[PDB]
Amino acid sequence: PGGDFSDPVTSATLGIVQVFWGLDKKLAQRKHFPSVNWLISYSKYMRALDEYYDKHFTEFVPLRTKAKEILQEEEDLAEIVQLVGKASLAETDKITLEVAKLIKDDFLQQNGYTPYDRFCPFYKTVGMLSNMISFYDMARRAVETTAQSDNKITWSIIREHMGEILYKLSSMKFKDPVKDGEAKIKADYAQLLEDMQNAFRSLE
């Protein structure tokens, strides 16, 4: 009733269900889809599934943790920028908001009526996340690796050198599980990994 998770059916359900997918009116109001709030949702099953992921997708658990951290650090930075503006943020924080925008708009957003996006296999899913967080670690590394240096890397310097990489990263959602084989999608995403690393070498 009224969208309020204090409701007795919600409260009783949340005491029993191991997974909750809290769809949020704010995300719906912005027409973000599928509108799942990644701060109030939860899944207890990670404790078990870490064994399956460590057998079949060894990179995934680190990536999942780094995703959650970026997504939570976005909320802190957002609430301060909403009063102080962007000028107080360090370059790491500008990068954290940049990759959080990529995660929230190009990884976590998904359209239910687009043929290439209607469903996403896990091979595509882990690849997209792996590249966005690899970009985060490398872009953040470029700033931190130039602390106290004669020239310091910045979000603007990154945006200038890496613009093609940002377009390619946001474009990863367009790879089609029907017309593209999973090995092809993975090979294309591996080319984006090499493209990122070579483009980061032009900064460093």
């Binding site: 102080v84 503006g85 000028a87 107080s88």
Partner: protein, 99 residues
């Protein structure tokens, strides 16, 4: 950009070309060269004072703007929220008494 606010300031820039190089060539030039240094040094201190003044003026407005927002939060927004919360608690307890 300290504390999220742009403070303008000035840099003293020297372009080398003395447009008065030959002045007093016939007489007085030894003392005119000292005089050039004196006022050049004064211009540096004045560019500092001008920078301090631009900062002073910008800060005196920005501090007033900030304190006005803080006081509006402290004496408008928080009071509306607090009275609204107390009213909600009251009307929830009215529904609870009816039930």
């Amino acid at each position: 950009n300290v504390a999220g606010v742009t403070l303008p300031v000035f840099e003293h820039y020297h372009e080398g070309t003395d447009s008065y190089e030959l002045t007093g060539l016939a007489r007085g030039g030894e003392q005119l060269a000292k005089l050039k240094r004196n006022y050049a040094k004064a211009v540096e201190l004045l560019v500092e004072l001008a920078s301090l003044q631009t900062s002073f003026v910008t800060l005196d407005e920005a501090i007033k703007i900030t304190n006005r927002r803080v006081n509006a939060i402290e004496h408008v927004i928080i009071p509306r929220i607090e009275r609204t919360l107390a009213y909600i608690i009251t009307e929830l307890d009215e529904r609870e008494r009816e039930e």
